[PDB]
C-alpha cells in the first residue's frame, strides 16, 4: 500500500 501518503488508505 502507498507509503508516500499512508493516510490515503481507508
Amino acid at each position, epitope marked *: 500500500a*502507498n507509503s*508516500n*501518503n499512508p*493516510d490515503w488508505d*481507508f
Partner: antibody
Amino acid sequence: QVQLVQSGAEVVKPGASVKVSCKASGYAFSSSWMNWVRQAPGQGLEWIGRIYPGDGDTNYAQKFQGKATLTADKSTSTAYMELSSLRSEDTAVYFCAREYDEAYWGQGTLVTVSS
Amino acid sequence: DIQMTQTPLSLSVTPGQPASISCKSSQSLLYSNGKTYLNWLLQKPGQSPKRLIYLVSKLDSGVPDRFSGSGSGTDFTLKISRVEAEDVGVYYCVQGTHFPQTFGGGTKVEIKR
C-alpha cells in the same frame, strides 16, 4: 463527525515566527496523520508536512524543512505549527487537514507577515 | 515533484449543460499498489476545500451522481453531466501516489444564466 477548528488570523513582523493551532475532535487524535497546507494569494495550494501525534513522527516537503515545526499535544488533541524566519511572501492561508474516510479541512488561518 | 496541470482555467456553462475538467501529471499516478491515488477537491467562495472524489472515480459521501471521474495514468477528467447553480467554485485535482502530494492549478466554474 470529524471537525477541525483553527486559531484566528495574526500579523507578524518580518523575520519573526508564529504559532498556529488546530483543535481536533470526533476521531482518535493520537492515531491519525495531520496534514498542513498553504494556499497562496494567486499561487495554488502547497503541501507543507504532517505529524503523527502518537510517536510525534513528522515528515515535510523539502521546501519547508527547517522553516516549519509540527508539534502535537495529545493531552488536548491540538496539533500545532510554528513558522520561523518569515518573509512578506509567506503571507497566506494555512489549513490543517484529515484525509481518511471522512476528509476535512479547518477553516484556515490567515498569516500576514508585514512591517 | 509530480507537477499537475489543469484545463481549462475557467469555464462558463448554462445550467443543465455538461462540463469536463482535465488534469495531466508529469508521471503515472499508478503505484506499486494496484491503485492510482488521485482526488478531486471543490472550494466554494467562502469555504475550505472538500473532497469530492478519490481513487480516480470513488464519490465521497453525500455527493450527487452528477459528478464522475475517469482517466488512465497521466490524464484524468472530472465530469458534471448536469451543471447546477450550487456547483460554482474552484475545482482542484490532487496527487497522492508520489511524494509529496501536489495540487493542480484549479478550474473556476461559472454558471451562465
